[PDB]
Amino acid sequence: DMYIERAGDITWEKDAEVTGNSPRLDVALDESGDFSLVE
Amino acid sequence: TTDGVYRVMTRGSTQVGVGVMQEGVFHTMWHVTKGAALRSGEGRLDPYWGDVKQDLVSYCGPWKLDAAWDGLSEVQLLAVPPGERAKNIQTLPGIFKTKDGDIGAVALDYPAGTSGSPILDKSGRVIGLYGNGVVIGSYVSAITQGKR
Incomplete structure (x- = not known):
């Protein structure tokens, strides 16, 4: 039994926590949908 | 619905x-x-x-989401974590550089059950979904968008 339940509206929130960095990465995407790093 | x-x-x-x-x-x-x-x-x-x-x-129908990251602005992950209320996390995406072009990427590492959470632009439009990515031990998710 896979089922869904509403959890909220899709909205931007002005007072959201802010975190995370912004890496620039070379990647490849294979037939299975898997990303891998490339050098 | x-x-x-x-x-x-x-x-x-x-x-x-x-x-x-x-x-x-x-x-x-x-x-x-x-x-x-x-x-x-x-x-x-x-x-x-x-x-x-x-x-x-x-x-129920074809993919409807078509907004795209603008490459410059911060975005929000509208995370729906297991057992917790929906919560917005703001971030500046990095980039996946691929032979077919660049994809925005968010360096946020949340439980597997948040996969499919939407990433939003400042207008509230869904620019992709969270949860397919790579590890650099820190996970980085592509901003995955379909075609409308």
């Missing part, structure tokens, strides 16, 4: 993912449901389009 963000549950119950209802179509990542039918109350949602390489699937 109401527009919004939804938990994807399986049966005790476990949250396996998240998705977006928009314009009567439910959008999530292929690896969350593997294309299985979904229950919604007394109703049933059947898969309509899916693609393993994009890791995306839509139910």
